[PDB]
Each structure stands twice: as C-alpha cells, then as structure tokens.
Design a protein around this motif. Structure first.
Motif, PDB file in Angstrom:
ATOM      1  N   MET A 251       4.431  -6.963   7.108  1.00  0.00           N
ATOM      2  CA  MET A 251       5.067  -5.870   6.369  1.00  0.00           C
ATOM      3  C   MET A 251       5.206  -6.220   4.895  1.00  0.00           C
ATOM      4  N   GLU A 252       5.453  -7.497   4.565  1.00  0.00           N
ATOM      5  CA  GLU A 252       5.484  -7.897   3.166  1.00  0.00           C
ATOM      6  C   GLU A 252       4.138  -7.707   2.478  1.00  0.00           C
ATOM      7  N   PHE A 253       3.092  -8.352   3.001  1.00  0.00           N
ATOM      8  CA  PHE A 253       1.749  -8.198   2.467  1.00  0.00           C
ATOM      9  C   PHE A 253       1.314  -6.720   2.432  1.00  0.00           C
ATOM     10  N   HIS A 254       1.509  -6.030   3.542  1.00  0.00           N
ATOM     11  CA  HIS A 254       0.974  -4.739   3.688  1.00  0.00           C
ATOM     12  C   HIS A 254       1.598  -3.755   2.711  1.00  0.00           C
ATOM     13  N   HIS A 255       2.911  -3.867   2.505  1.00  0.00           N
ATOM     14  CA  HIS A 255       3.606  -2.948   1.641  1.00  0.00           C
ATOM     15  C   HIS A 255       3.570  -3.399   0.191  1.00  0.00           C
ATOM     16  N   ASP A 256       3.858  -4.661  -0.074  1.00  0.00           N
ATOM     17  CA  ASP A 256       4.006  -5.152  -1.487  1.00  0.00           C
ATOM     18  C   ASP A 256       2.679  -5.480  -2.173  1.00  0.00           C
ATOM     19  N   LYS A 257       1.654  -5.834  -1.388  1.00  0.00           N
ATOM     20  CA  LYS A 257       0.320  -6.042  -1.911  1.00  0.00           C
ATOM     21  C   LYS A 257      -0.627  -4.871  -1.709  1.00  0.00           C
ATOM     22  N   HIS A 258      -0.975  -4.568  -0.454  1.00  0.00           N
ATOM     23  CA  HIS A 258      -2.067  -3.612  -0.219  1.00  0.00           C
ATOM     24  C   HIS A 258      -1.687  -2.240  -0.698  1.00  0.00           C
TER      25      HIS A 258
ATOM     26  N   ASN B 233       0.801  -1.451  -2.812  1.00  0.00           N
ATOM     27  CA  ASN B 233       0.997  -1.509  -4.252  1.00  0.00           C
ATOM     28  C   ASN B 233      -0.308  -1.442  -5.072  1.00  0.00           C
ATOM     29  N   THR B 234      -1.373  -2.138  -4.610  1.00  0.00           N
ATOM     30  CA  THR B 234      -2.698  -2.057  -5.225  1.00  0.00           C
ATOM     31  C   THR B 234      -3.225  -0.627  -5.198  1.00  0.00           C
ATOM     32  N   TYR B 235      -3.130   0.108  -4.075  1.00  0.00           N
ATOM     33  CA  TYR B 235      -3.666   1.484  -4.083  1.00  0.00           C
ATOM     34  C   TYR B 235      -2.955   2.326  -5.119  1.00  0.00           C
ATOM     35  N   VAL B 236      -1.663   2.101  -5.294  1.00  0.00           N
ATOM     36  CA  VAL B 236      -0.862   2.902  -6.267  1.00  0.00           C
ATOM     37  C   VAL B 236      -1.223   2.600  -7.715  1.00  0.00           C
ATOM     38  N   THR B 237      -1.381   1.304  -8.006  1.00  0.00           N
ATOM     39  CA  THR B 237      -1.716   0.829  -9.349  1.00  0.00           C
ATOM     40  C   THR B 237      -3.053   1.419  -9.811  1.00  0.00           C
ATOM     41  N   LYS B 238      -4.031   1.302  -8.949  1.00  0.00           N
ATOM     42  CA  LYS B 238      -5.355   1.818  -9.196  1.00  0.00           C
ATOM     43  C   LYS B 238      -5.378   3.296  -9.274  1.00  0.00           C
ATOM     44  N   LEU B 239      -4.577   3.938  -8.453  1.00  0.00           N
ATOM     45  CA  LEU B 239      -4.462   5.403  -8.502  1.00  0.00           C
ATOM     46  C   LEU B 239      -3.996   5.818  -9.850  1.00  0.00           C
ATOM     47  N   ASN B 240      -2.997   5.139 -10.373  1.00  0.00           N
ATOM     48  CA  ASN B 240      -2.386   5.506 -11.697  1.00  0.00           C
ATOM     49  C   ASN B 240      -3.284   5.187 -12.844  1.00  0.00           C
TER      50      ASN B 240
ATOM     51  N   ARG C 170     -10.102   9.454  -3.998  1.00  0.00           N
ATOM     52  CA  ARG C 170     -10.387   9.366  -2.570  1.00  0.00           C
ATOM     53  C   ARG C 170      -9.844   8.106  -1.932  1.00  0.00           C
ATOM     54  N   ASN C 171     -10.188   6.990  -2.517  1.00  0.00           N
ATOM     55  CA  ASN C 171      -9.865   5.679  -1.955  1.00  0.00           C
ATOM     56  C   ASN C 171      -8.418   5.264  -2.206  1.00  0.00           C
ATOM     57  N   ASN C 172      -8.012   5.329  -3.457  1.00  0.00           N
ATOM     58  CA  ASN C 172      -6.695   4.906  -3.872  1.00  0.00           C
ATOM     59  C   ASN C 172      -5.623   5.980  -3.619  1.00  0.00           C
ATOM     60  N   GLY C 173      -5.939   7.248  -3.871  1.00  0.00           N
ATOM     61  CA  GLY C 173      -5.049   8.329  -3.563  1.00  0.00           C
ATOM     62  C   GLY C 173      -4.860   8.438  -2.050  1.00  0.00           C
ATOM     63  N   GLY C 174      -5.990   8.345  -1.312  1.00  0.00           N
ATOM     64  CA  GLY C 174      -5.954   8.207   0.109  1.00  0.00           C
ATOM     65  C   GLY C 174      -5.033   7.046   0.469  1.00  0.00           C
ATOM     66  N   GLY C 175      -5.282   5.890  -0.117  1.00  0.00           N
ATOM     67  CA  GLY C 175      -4.486   4.716   0.216  1.00  0.00           C
ATOM     68  C   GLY C 175      -2.989   4.908  -0.010  1.00  0.00           C
ATOM     69  N   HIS C 176      -2.644   5.654  -1.053  1.00  0.00           N
ATOM     70  CA  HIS C 176      -1.249   5.881  -1.378  1.00  0.00           C
ATOM     71  C   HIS C 176      -0.610   6.923  -0.397  1.00  0.00           C
ATOM     72  N   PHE C 177      -1.293   8.045  -0.209  1.00  0.00           N
ATOM     73  CA  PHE C 177      -0.853   9.039   0.772  1.00  0.00           C
ATOM     74  C   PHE C 177      -0.695   8.374   2.134  1.00  0.00           C
TER      75      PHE C 177
END
Ligand SMILES: [Mn+2]
Ligand SMILES: [Mn+2]
Lengths: 198, 198
Positions: free
Chosen positions: B23-30, B32-39, B71-78
């Motif tokens: 849950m740490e890796f999945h939420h704080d890394k993976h 978080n990366t989709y959100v950063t890239k999305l922005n 697609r990828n990052n917005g998908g990842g964030h949604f």
C-alpha cells in the motif's frame, strides 16, 4: 511436449544484478506456468509436434481457438528460454556483433542509451529487443509476450520488463534494473545468433 | 492541477489481505507518478478545468500531443483513485447492487467465478471491472490503464491485476490475491456508484 529448460548457472549467480529469489520465482513459477498451459493447449492435436518459432512466426495460421494460448504461453516459453541463454555471470563486451553495433551507433553507449530509453518508457508489461531486419540491426519493443518473429525480424537479445522480473529487488525502479542488465549480457550467445541471422 | 488523494484508512488497514508495504509503494509511488505526469501534460491548458471522467470518455478529442499521457496517466489517476475508495477494512456483502447481481447471475458466487476467471486469465498488465452498460451489468477487462468510460460504460468496481499490486505478498499467485480481494470490497461505495449510473 514442451519442457522447462534448466538454468545454465546457479540461482544466485547473477547477484547482485538479479536477486536469487527472483530467479527462483521467475524460472520455476512464471516460466513453468507458460509451459504447462502451452502443453494443455497443443497436446493430443495435430499441432503437438509443431515448432514454437514457426507457430509464433505464423500466428495467423494457428487455429482461432488455440491462438491466444499459443501467442501468450508460447510467446512466454520462447521468450524466457532465450532470456536465460542471453544472461551470463561472465559478460565480456566482445564479438563481431559488438563491432557492428559500434559501426551503426558510433559507440556502445549510444546503443545502450537508445535501448534503455525504449525499455524504460515501455508502458505496461513487455520486452525490449535487438533484432536483425534484413541485414540491419534495430531495437524494438513488444507488449506482453509478443515476439518480433511475428513481424518477420530475428531476435538476438531481449530484456524482460514485466514487473515480476524486477519487483522484489527494485520495486518501481526499473531504470536501475536496466543499468544492471548490461553487466550480465552473454554477448557470446548474442554473437552466435547474430552470425546466423545476418 | 490534479492531486494525489489521501488513503481513506491506515496503510496497514487491509492486512493481512494486502500488506502495508504494498500500500505504501502502490499509493505513494505508482499512483503519485501517474498524477505527476498527468499534470505535466495538462497544467497550463484547457484540460486542467475538465473532469477526468469526461476527458477519458472522449480521449479521441484530446489533442494528438497530449493523448497518450491522458490515456495512460489520466487512466492511472482515475483508476487508482477509484481503487482506494472501493477497498475497505470492513467489507460486508451488502447493497442493492448485490440484489441485481443475483438477479442477473443467479448467485453472488456465479458472479465471483466469472469475475475471477476474467481477472486470472487477463494477460499482462490491466484491470478487471464491473460496469453498467445501458442499464445492464457486465464484467470486462482492460489493458494497462485503459478504462471502460472510453467505450461508453460506467465503472462501479475495479480490480488491479498489474503485478505491482500483488507481487511483494503473493508473487506469481494472482488467484490467491483474487480470493483475498473479496474480503476487502467496499460494497457500500460500489452500491452508491451503481444507484447513480442505473
Ligand atoms: Mn518474465
Ligand atoms: Mn496499480
């Protein structure tokens, strides 16, 4: 039947570049599953003595109801069988293939940078490849267990970026696993495969 | 700008079904990366004041240079935002949606079997979903961070079968991770989403 090949080295031989535990899971579980499922699909049928390379190269001729398993599981078996062979605890960056990489890219580092950039931006599960296409070397990606033979190109080196190949040691840090890989390429095997395919 | 949501529970709240470390890796890394890239893609543009749902629903209208990241990052964030909300430290199989599942599949177990079978045979990285399509419930799969909104269907439950979601605890045993997931579905949240999309 298809059979799980034995590793050509001990499970801990590639430390620290690939951890022991990963080699256990990756070879005895993931690869073993691809083989088991592949055999469940083809055994008892006229495909049971057909070469893997021929089926992958001509997926379109595989019967519709067997195609997904042949693609995914057969891909999985081909791709991992080759992967173990192209790794080595004694990597030396030598051979005719290395000379031809220098000739095409300028330096070995320029090649490693193009390959790394493709491996690290590959989205989802897949593989990065060095292939021969006609006489020429090129670097491509495939998704999942797809294989460039399907597109008429011959593979001579491949790198597994499915998360199971690096998660236990590197978690999300796939670029560190890329940089590690270079130290364990069996360039000797790559060279044999290259001489045969040019 | 989009924002990484806080988990609605402690990181260890889903033990022993999902380990704390994942849950740490999945939420704080993976995630978080989709959100950063999305922005990085949408900040400074028209799309920064558009719903994520609407953009993913109409990917084809996203400008060519931005579409892959949306697609990828917005998908990842949604997809991950929804995922945390549909998990619960107290999963109770209760809601009006379960009455309609019984009506369509006969029993909750028949639904769980069709969902399990689709999740376990999904090849590579992806998600298994319960969706509403034009009034009807259906179970579908998507690759990577693709999302059924893009095909005109509304999601109400999703299950992450990217190997990063289960490798640390379950390694290759994705069926054990499926069986565990049933004990942590926030069926209450599923039901709210279902009542809205009927
Ligand atoms: Mn692999
Ligand atoms: Mn995920």
């Amino acid at each position: 039947a298809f059979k799980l090949p034995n590793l050509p080295y001990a499970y801990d031989a590639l430390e620290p570049y690939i951890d022991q535990r990963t080699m256990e899971f990756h070879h005895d579980k993931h690869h073993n599953t691809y083989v088991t499922k592949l055999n469940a699909t083809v055994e008892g049928t006229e495909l049971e003595h057909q070469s893997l390379a021929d089926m992958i190269a001509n997926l379109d001729k595989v019967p519709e109801a067997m195609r997904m398993s042949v693609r995914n599981n057969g891909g999985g078996h081909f791709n991992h069988s080759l992967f173990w062979e192209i790794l080595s605890p004694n990597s030396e960056e030598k051979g005719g293939v290395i000379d031809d990489i220098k000739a095409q890219w300028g330096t070995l580092d320029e090649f490693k940078n193009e390959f790394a950039n493709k491996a690290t931006t590959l989205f989802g599960s897949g593989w990065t490849w060095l292939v021969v296409n006609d006489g020429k070397l090129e670097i491509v990606t495939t998704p999942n267990q797809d294989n460039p033979l399907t597109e008429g190109k011959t593979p001579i080196l491949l790198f597994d970026v499915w998360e199971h190949a690096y998660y236990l040691k590197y978690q999300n840090k796939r670029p560190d696993y890329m940089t590690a890989f270079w130290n364990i390429v069996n360039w000797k095997k790559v060279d044999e495969l290259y001489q045969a395919a040019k």
